[PDB]
Ligand binder design. Structure first.
Ligand SMILES: [Zn+2]
Ligand SMILES: [Zn+2]
Lengths: 553, 553
RNA sequence: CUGGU
RNA sequence: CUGGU
């Protein structure tokens, strides 16, 4: 370690900037690298078929030997979910590199790795306290600090480098009454700010939300209020990783003499591990859907998936498609212990409307305080800003709107930062004792994943999938022979253009006759058919349908 | 007119039930019919290409001679927009049937009819007061009453029939301080309730919202607050039909010495008519975008479209695509004087993020009280329920969720209705002095409209457009000749299935060879190729792509 | 409770 | 801040 003008820390976010999911940040000093989380993202913007989204680790594959350790802040999908895809890409089916995480974080990763044909023993999973102090290589001293969020065992991290202090808040809220009674530890954060914070990296999710984010204890009381009032069966949907919320529901069920049943693999995965490691206390046991069937209504509570109106989720199956023993009977109580994520609003709305139609009482925010964001609002963020007083600021875990507002929030403070930068995935930020700026970019992006594997859906597949939905398809079949025949057919094409299909046959027949006379190859006849039919349809319908000219000898 | 068991009123909603748009209700007694509004609906659920949605008037086409009059409550698109398509379908390019509406309502319809190749003189447009009393045939006495909403000249209607009173609230809110100072007239409503209300049909939009909906005067003050604070140019987007909101913006511009410019044809249409009929007061004049260009920033205010993040709107062009003289310059103020409609949330979010990135200050609710719903909340609805005390209730202008809540709201009242029914488009409700029930259904649905005309996009076009986006396309070309050749190509198909394309060629070649040997017609060879390739791909990829087997001799 | 280079 | 008959 040393200092001066040549010494600097390089921060490279490969995901989680200008967005909410697939968090992965790269920290570099000299010839050493440390990675902060290996996240996953979810779709629904205009992407069909795609199940998951994983960041492009091209920088990590290239520098695979400089990686000294992988540090994980929490066990939620947008922080660990990407790893059983990123790990074999960077190291292969085994690695001695240390993977640091808390009991629940590594407990969840063990299950994730094991289900993908891997062995947890093949990778170096090193358990640490959420408040642990760890050394990474020769240049990084990582001081982890407990922070209240949606999942237990969630941490922030004070990154001590040879040029200055970097405070990373992680995903947080300043919940005074958490469900497990394990409060946010601000000592290290307050000690770091007193030493002096060179750079603060903070959760920007709710930088536009005024006030304070409600406690999980407040939500637990309102869930106990609504469950106790319910007449028959109770159906509760939440995000799968929300162990604390799952606890609040079980507490209520147990308080009213109800037996908890679980449906939906995502939520069954998180709970199995959580219960095993003492993160979920259940006075009785989690019953099967088969066992609960015979029980009377007022003694039944089913915890399930589908809080975002997902097509194959349990709540969707209950509303639309159908389920084995789970049918929405008139009089049922359905609590959506979540909020619609921007883009999944209509999917939640459709399911809610379908549920209501079946005789069920559908409970949800803002009408009933059944959900709180796991992220800090303005008052909690201002507290952190004042506790740290950083020289430089880098808002994270939010979109451009959320980042700009945290920038303004930091500028309205007594001692604002010297400069604030809006973080982008793939950017390379150079950090010295007195400077903080973008210096370049590294290969970045996303990889589309489905049940058939990683990269089974590409950018092209999706790009032309848009073309087909937006404008339609025109398939022209041309026979490059002695007797030429052109047959043109369509699917999802406007009736105005459908009327013009007869002219398309004649349009291509002309181009086919010229292709044979000149004895042009089939690859040149295609382009003699494509382009004129493209300009004809745009000038007659305004549309740009996907024109597929098939040329056979 | 008469009474007893055989006398009854038939209510047939052709649109506006179980939804928010395309309002059209049919009222029948004996051999006479009266229509309440001729609405239009907007898409964005999973419908590409589609511009507008118009109800299926198959009942009105069949009974075109029983129609005594067409009554219009307001000039908003979801109440009048459908008419320059429904009118030629029911009557033809001319009709002597009376079309009743207020000055603004008919003023807007005149413009709408005229732009579609019609003449306003060809139809019988009869101007009435928003508080007028009108006779329709021999059985209907229609008592219109002014109600505060988003557009001026908006009415409710007390429908007096030979069997009882039907109170229709229309689209409303109980705004104490409207922008034009033309308050809601509750006298007729209170008089009807004292006589006794047989059926109430009421606006259910905000039946889940507690309290009272804020006044347009409250929004005007907050818009004046934000415009006065703005440093440079001001960009304001609202819904086009919101004349009162457009007035509140002009008032603020004029208060700070700014000149108003207008871009976006939808908003240019409503304002031209409104200004002409004295519904919009502008101290100076609405300037062109060309004239305002040279003016300094703090003296520029541009009123535009794109409050729902619409692809070809002015605000979208400013953010994404591009505009002639309108570029988002860093320092600009952008006020989204609206709310995201469920389903258009991500479109608004994308535009907001794109705007922020360009250096603009983006203002919107809930952070700034720049928008109020034009619909009554719980307190206003309870007031109406108590003012009317109906024997029977029919919630309207809302989805199943909104309808169920109004049903509960009406059941928590001191004197609840005898029965409440959840209104569905195409249903036929029989109403007698002591009964109210569903008796049958009539041909109903929607028609997809675009710039190329009505029905240019069908249900099939959209249905197979989904197939193409969801799973992809497999085009198999088979040559039913002496020398058979099978060429299989794909677009938007999964790489797992793309790998299996070679086997598809062999799969169809087998079926082609059997088709020739048996001398089967080309229409039977297609099905010999289609079905086996369909079952093969589902058992190897799980996907159901659109298989297009093209057979040529 | 929506648009139309 | 999301799923997996
Ligand atoms: Zn997170
Ligand atoms: Zn309306």
């Amino acid at each position: 370690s040393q200092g001066g003008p040549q010494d600097h820390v390089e921060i490279i976010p490969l995901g989680g900037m200008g967005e909410i999911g697939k968090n992965i940040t790269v920290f570099r000093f000299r010839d050493e690298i440390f990675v902060l989380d290996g996240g996953l993202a979810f779709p629904e913007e205009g992407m069909p078929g795609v199940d998951l989204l994983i960041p492009r680790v091209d920088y990590l594959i290239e520098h695979r030997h400089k990686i000294k350790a992988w540090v994980l802040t929490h066990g939620a999908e947008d922080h660990i979910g990407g790893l059983p895809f990123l790990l074999p890409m960077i190291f292969g089916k085994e690695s001695p590199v240390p993977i640091y995480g808390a009991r629940l974080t590594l407990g969840l990763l063990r299950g994730k790795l094991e289900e993908f044909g891997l062995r947890p023993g093949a990778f170096n999973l090193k358990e640490i306290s959420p408040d642990d102090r760890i050394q990474v290589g020769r240049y990084f001293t990582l001081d982890l600090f407990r922070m209240t969020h949606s999942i237990p065992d969630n941490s922030g991290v004070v990154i001590r480098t040879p040029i200055g202090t970097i405070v990373h808040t992680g995903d947080f809220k300043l919940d005074p009454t958490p469900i497990d009674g394990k409060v946010s530890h601000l000592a290290k954060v307050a000690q770091a700010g007193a030493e002096g914070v060179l750079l603060l990296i903070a959760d920007a999710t709710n930088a536009e939300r005024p006030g304070y984010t409600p406690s999980e204890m407040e939500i637990a009381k309102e869930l106990d209020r609504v469950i106790g009032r319910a007449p028959g069966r109770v159906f509760v949907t939440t995000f799968a990783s929300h162990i604390h919320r799952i606890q609040s529901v079980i507490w209520a069920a147990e308080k009213y003499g109800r037996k908890v049943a679980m449906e939906g693999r995502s939520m069954l995965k998180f709970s199995r591990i959580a219960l095993e490691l003492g993160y979920l206390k259940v006075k009785d046991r989690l019953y099967t859907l088969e066992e609960v069937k015979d029980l009377p209504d007022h003694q039944v509570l089913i915890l399930a998936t589908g809080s975002q109106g997902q097509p194959m989720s349990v709540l969707h199956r209950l509303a639309f498609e159908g389920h084995a023993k789970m049918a929405i009977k008139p009089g049922d109580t359905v609590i959506l212990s979540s909020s619609p994520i921007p883009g999944n609003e209509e999917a939640v709305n459709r399911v809610i409307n379908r549920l209501y139609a079946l005789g069920a009482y559908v409970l949800y925010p803002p009408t009933y305080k059944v959900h709180a964001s796991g992220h800090a609002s303005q008052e909690e963020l201002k507290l952190i800003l004042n506790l740290t007083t950083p020289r430089f600021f880098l808002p994270w875990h939010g979109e451009v709107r959320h980042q700009m507002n945290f920038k303004w929030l930091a500028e309205s403070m007594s001692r604002p930062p010297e400069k604030t930068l809006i973080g982008e995935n793939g950017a390379v930020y150079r950090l010295t004792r007195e400077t903080f700026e973008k210096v370049g970019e590294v290969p970045h992006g996303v990889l589309y994943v489905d049940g058939l594997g990683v990269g089974d859906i590409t950018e092209e597949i999706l790009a032309d999938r848009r073309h087909m939905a937006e404008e339609g398809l025109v398939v022209i079949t041309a026979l490059a022979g002695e007797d030429p025949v052109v047959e043109v057919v369509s699917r999802g094409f406007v009736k105005a253009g459908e009327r013009l299909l007869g002219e398309v046959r004649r349009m291509a027949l002309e181009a086919l006759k010229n292709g044979v006379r000149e004895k042009k190859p089939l690859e040149r006849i295609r382009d003699d058919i494509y382009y004129p039919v493209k300009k004809f349809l745009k000038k007659a319908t305004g549309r740009d349908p996907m024109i597929l000219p098939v040329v056979i000898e």
